Design a protein around this ligand. Structure first.
Ligand SMILES: Cc1noc(NS(=O)(=O)c2ccc(NCc3cnc4nc(N)[nH]c(=O)c4n3)cc2)c1C
Ligand SMILES: Cc1noc(NS(=O)(=O)c2ccc(NCc3cnc4nc(N)[nH]c(=O)c4n3)cc2)c1C
Lengths: 252, 257
């Protein structure tokens, strides 16, 4: 029904999009891994310097060369998983397409830097107790959506992530997964990250490397509920699953 | 509710995985594979002496493949045993061996099949079917009319309504568009108030989309299983049990939330 655009490049959101995770914790490995994910069918590459502290220069040193190298190398959406205004701006210079912040630009100067770039930004819900899980998330997004538009970032440039595994217990996560379709009322793209998280592990009683099937199953359930972007470790498997999903949905 | 045979119950509040146990071109290997699938979490084992994908099979030949396996499993394991047969002789003999469920793609239309199946008193699964290019005026209506027709045949024959299972038959006289049309509208078949069994594992509906060989169709098959189970499909017929079982755990947890 819709699409999102950056730097003359467009991301089709009528179909589920797979975002490959590229955590940095060697430049050569990063470029090659990105290549592996891209061929696997990823339409976005997410570069993250923190795992949910890191120094500003240290985080910048890891992130921006990878962004620039990929920007030169491939015509693909580039996303930086950062919460730092310096990293926001520097990545924009490097050629990043999307700003993905788990802290929702609440760090000092982060909001202004993001606004100046004009790049699309993804807002993620974060805190364990909830009176009503879904209501809290809806209220959270509404607040920062109000804030983002106020900052001069257009509403249609925003993405929403309910933030699986962030200040949420096992029951909450699957409650969220079950009611995920409700979040579409914002008429904004939904991005979800469930890959290899505890919500899979606790159920299957398997280590992270054995959580591929569980992660994909979650991705399929989310995508069947209209989730547009899926953030995963295992791109190829997720891409294959999304093909089944898209064929099913297109079949009406 | 549950499905019942010989004092065994199958919980239908949760998705059940039926492991595929083909016995075609050693009993020892079959038992190891079945036990492995059993270990993976399968609650049903489907034993087939015929290939529905094919050269025909003799009555004695199919019997030779099927019944020793059924007898072997019945003693060794407490699991639902399903026989994938269209032959009254195989139906009757397998029932003697201790089979719990009759899975017939041809819906008991072979000679004497209906009568033989009825006498066993065992639950039966009916499957919709149609070189010919698959066409439907309306796929779901055609399937609904098919099930309505054969359900009456079974009931008239003396097979109780609660003993019946319905399979829309993925990949049987259906093209790629048809199969996913069926998957999308699968929930509609619940109106018969009968358990639904689906078989999409490693089938062309996955293969044509991903363009990979059968052994590499695991993820696609699991994706189909999840979608079907989310639409309330009770029994899933798969080659890869462990992966499907893990997926069903995510599905059941999601629904139970
Ligand atoms: C220790 C320890 N390690 O993991 C856990 N448990 S956990 O639920 O699986 C878990 C929770 C969170 C994460 N963060 C990973 C992560 C990173 N970036 C993201 N960006 C976006 N936009 N959306 C996301 O969802 C997201 N998630 C990784 C693992 C414990 C406890
Ligand atoms: C030849 C040839 N080989 O594969 C194809 N394409 S196919 O769609 O993948 C395909 C089609 C049918 C099968 N038969 C396998 C099979 C056997 N018994 C079943 N019993 C039940 N209850 N339900 C089932 O779905 C089912 N499926 C296996 C593969 C053709 C055509």
């Amino acid at each position: 029904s819709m699409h999102l655009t950056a730097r003359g490049l467009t991301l089709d959101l009528s179909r589920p999009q797979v975002m490959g995770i590229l955590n940095v914790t060697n430049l050569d490995q990063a470029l090659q891994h990105a290549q592996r994910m891209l061929s696997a069918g990823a339409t976005l590459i997410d570069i993250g310097g923190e795992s949910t502290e890191v120094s500003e220069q240290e985080e910048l040193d890891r992130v921006v060369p990878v962004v620039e190298a990929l920007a030169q190398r491939f015509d693909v959406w580039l996303s930086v998983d950062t919460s730092k205004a310096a990293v926001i701006t520097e990545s924009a210079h490097a050629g990043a397409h999307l700003i993905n912040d788990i802290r929702s630009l609440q760090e000092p100067g982060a909001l202004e830097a993001a606004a100046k770039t004009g790049l699309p930004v993804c807002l993620m819900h974060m805190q364990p107790y909830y009176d009503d899980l879904m209501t809290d998330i809806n209220r959270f997004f509404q607040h920062h959506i109000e804030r983002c538009v106020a900052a001069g970032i257009a509403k249609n440039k925003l993405l929403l992530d309910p933030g699986f595994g962030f200040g949420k217990n096992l029951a909450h996560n699957y409650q969220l997964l079950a009611h995920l379709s409700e979040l579409h009322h914002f008429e904004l793209p939904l991005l979800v990250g469930m890959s290899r998280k505890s919500m899979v592990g606790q159920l299957l009683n398997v280590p992270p490397q054995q959580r591929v099937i569980g992660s994909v199953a979650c991705a399929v359930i989310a995508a069947m509920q209209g989730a547009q972007i899926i953030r995963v470790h295992d791109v190829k498997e997720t891409v294959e699953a999304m093909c089944i999903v898209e064929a099913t949905r297109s079949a009406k």
